[PDB]
Design a protein around this ligand. Structure first.
Ligand code: HEM
Ligand SMILES: [K+]
Length: 249
């Protein structure tokens, strides 16, 4: 149900040039996981029933950055501002989602389709809509399904974004990477989840909830066995996430 807006030729040219500059910048700074978390936290506030929140540029506002869920994301916003300023025609909304898409690509993930046109909105959404790492499946469905409107399949594939990156005790309070290759986008998140607790590697209660839910567990198993299946479902879910509320909800 998407109808993407028309943008001018100059806008499309800047998207293409921004995409290339973002690859070099994100690869150089080794910040792909942080930029994916910035894109996701930008989009993950969407509430379908009210059409509030979502990927509309509000996370750079200090009021949204101050949310505890966003601890550390001010680094990301600061890191991107010089590059953003080279593309004044792009919305911050599109810029941050483009950074998320590129973060996945440059770590070796699928190519997530990207459509421009998001407008920057003035009001951040209320705090408290992003998922709580200490809760379980019922909570995940409340947040991804009843608020955002995404599917159970989308929940498991998007959880796989933890295949890159790490937690930090001074940000969430959790600490360490989910995988042994945290700058490589692959299905290792699911293979670690299945294998048990390995020393040095992180599992949140929200990751573990995937193993005991009757719908989520068959997906974890599919993704652990079939990385190509993981990439297809990942790319579908990330595109949907990045487009919540945009070009028809
Ligand atoms: C399923 C519900 C989820 C919960 C409860 C959750 C929770 C967390 C927490 C607590 C952290 C650690 C932050 C820190 O201390 O630095 C984290 C990091 C991260 N999250 Fe999630 N997350 C969820 C879903 C997602 C999704 C849907 C994506 C994107 C597809 C994503 C991508 C990441 C990435 C890449 C990091 C690493 C950031 C870094 O390395 O700095 N997560 N998440
Ligand atoms: K990995």
């Amino acid at each position: 149900g998407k109808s993407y807006p028309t943008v001018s030729a100059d806008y499309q040219k800047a998207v293409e040039k921004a995409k290339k500059k973002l690859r070099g910048f994100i690869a150089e700074k080794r910040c792909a996981p942080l930029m994916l978390r910035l894109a996701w936290h930008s989009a993950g506030t969407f509430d379908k029933g009210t059409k509030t929140g979502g990927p509309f540029g509000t996370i750079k506002h200090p009021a949204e950055l101050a949310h505890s869920a966003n601890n550390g994301l001010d680094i990301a916003v600061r890191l991107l501002e010089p590059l953003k300023a080279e593309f004044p025609i792009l919305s911050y909304a599109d810029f941050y989602q483009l950074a998320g898409v590129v973060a996945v690509e440059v770590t070796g993930g699928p190519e997530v389709p990207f459509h421009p046109g998001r407008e920057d909105k003035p009001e951040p959404p209320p705090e408290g809509r992003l998922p709580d790492a200490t809760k379980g499946s019922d909570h995940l469905r409340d947040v991804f399904g009843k608020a955002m409107g995404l599917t159970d399949q989308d929940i498991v594939a998007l959880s796989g974004g933890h295949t890159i990156g790490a937690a930090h005790k001074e940000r969430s309070g959790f600490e360490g990477p989910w995988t042994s290759n945290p700058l490589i986008f692959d299905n290792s998140y699911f293979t670690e989840l299945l294998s048990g607790e390995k020393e040095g590697l992180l599992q949140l209660p929200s990751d573990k909830a995937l193993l005991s839910d009757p719908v989520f567990r068959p997906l974890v198993d599919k993704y652990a066995a079939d990385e190509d299946a993981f990439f297809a479902d990942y790319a579908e879910a990330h595109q949907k996430l990045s487009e919540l509320g945009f070009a028809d909800a």
